[PDB]
Structures are given as structure tokens and as C-alpha cells.
Amino acid sequence: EVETFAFQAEIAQLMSLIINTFYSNKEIFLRELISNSSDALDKIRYESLTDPSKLDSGKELHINLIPNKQDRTLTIVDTGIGMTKADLINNLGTIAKSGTKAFMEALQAGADISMIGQFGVGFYSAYLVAEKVTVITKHNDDEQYAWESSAGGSFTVRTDTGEPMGRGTKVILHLKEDQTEYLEERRIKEIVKKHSQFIGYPITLFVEK
Ligand SMILES: Cc1nnc(-c2cccc(Br)c2)o1
């Protein structure tokens, strides 16, 4: 049972700008997604400080990077607070309408796409490298859901029958054919060391057979 939603017009515009603008520095997508994971991990850690049972769904707080060259996917997994269904529908827990407004004014007033995270909409930088993005998520207060979009103005939400997650979020980037450098170990390592060296959670780069 799959529900299809229209993006708000401002978010559709943000996504088309990310997809259509010539902009070579695409690697910042990974920094933005790792920073989102770190923010989600901070949230569940804060909640556990007064309620240890918040970690009954998993005590470990970490980030995994899982490249799969056969599927042409890069998956970013975290065990943060996760998202409810309502969060997913409401722009993946962001204030994306006001964030997009600010970001697009900054762009005409000097800034560049790499600055997107300062506007709270860094998730959408996934579309610098991905033709499709699938988000699997589990929040303590809701069931496991899958969000998905290939842009084009719409996204879907469904209950996820896949492998149960415990708690957290999995961002599956279905990479564009010309963006497969981001599945190579040495490239991913380079980007994490350049842009994510001060993230306060373990980041494990899985290797492939
Ligand atoms: C708003 C807004 N105006 N241009 C952009 C943009 C262009 C290329 C890459 C990225 Br990320 C963002 O965002």
C-alpha cells in the first residue's frame, strides 16, 4: 500500500536547482548526510540522558557507509533518533520551506551550493549524485517506513517490510551512472577525512567482496 505525495512547490524548486545547476563540487553530499546523521544521533543521545529506555532499540550510536557496486548504491546508515511517518512527509524532519527561501537568496547574493547545510536542507544535496533516493527509518514512537523519490515533483511513503532496523535512518543513494566514483574506497575515505574529521561518532566504511 503506497502513498504518493506532491512536494511543496518550493522544495520541488530546490531539487530542480540541485539537479540542473552546473556545479562540479558534488562530493559535499556525503558531508551533508553524515552531518544529518550526527544531528540525529545527538538527539537520541540527549533523550537517553534522562530516559535510558530510549536506547532499548539499540545502544550503539554509529554511522556506517555501505557501498554496493553491483546495485550501484551508496547507503548511509545511522542509529540516531529516526523519523516518524509525519516527519518523513514533512520534508524529512526539516523546515525546508523556510530553509529553501534563505538558501536561494544566498545563492543570488554570492553563495554556492556547498553551503546548503547552513540552511537546514542538506539532505537534498543527495540529488547531486543520486537519480533516486530511498530513506528507510524507524523512530521509537512509530513503525518502520520507506520514503522514496526520483524527484520529478513527487515522493512515496510506504510501510517497510524489509529487514527490521531497530532505530535510526538508512539513506540509500541510487547513484547516477557517471557518479560511481563515490563507491570507490579510496574516494570515500578521502571525502570523510576532508569534510567529516570532527564527527563525534564512529564512521565505518564497509568493504566489498
Ligand atoms: C537555492 C539554490 N540555488 N542554487 C542552488 C544549488 C545549485 C547547485 C547545487 C546545490 Br547543492 C544548490 O541552490
Query: What CATH code is carried by the domain that includes residue 199?
Result: 3.30.565.10
Ligand 1 atom nearest 14 alpha carbon: 1
| φ, ψ for residue 182, nearest 5 deg | -80, 5
Distance (angstroms) between ligand 1 centre and the Cα of 110 equals: 12
What residues are designated binding site? 36, 78, 97, 123
Distance (angstroms) between ligand 1 centre and the Cα of 80 equals: 27
The rounded distance, in Å, linking the Cα atoms of 196 and 190 is 10
Q: Cβ < 6 Å from ligand 1: which residues?
A: 14, 17-18, 21, 23, 103-104, 107, 113, 116, 125, 128
| φ, ψ for residue 87, nearest 5 deg | -60, -45
Q: Look up the domain containing 109 and give its range.
A: 3-205
Close Cβ partners of 88 (under 8 Å, ≥ 6 residues apart):
135, 137, 145, 147, 157
The x, y and z cell numbers of residue 165, run together, are: 532496523
| φ, ψ for residue 202, nearest 5 deg | -65, 130
Identify the experimental approach.
X-ray
How many distinct structural domains can be found in the chain? 1
Distance (angstroms) between ligand 1 centre and the Cα of 151 equals: 15
What residues are designated binding site for ATP? 36, 78, 97, 123
- Which residue, judged by its Cα, is nearest atom 3 of ligand 1? 104
Distance (angstroms) between ligand 1 centre and the Cα of 108 equals: 10
Ligand 1 atom nearest 114 alpha carbon: 11
Distance (angstroms) between ligand 1 centre and the Cα of 106 equals: 10
Q: How many residues does the chain have?
A: 209
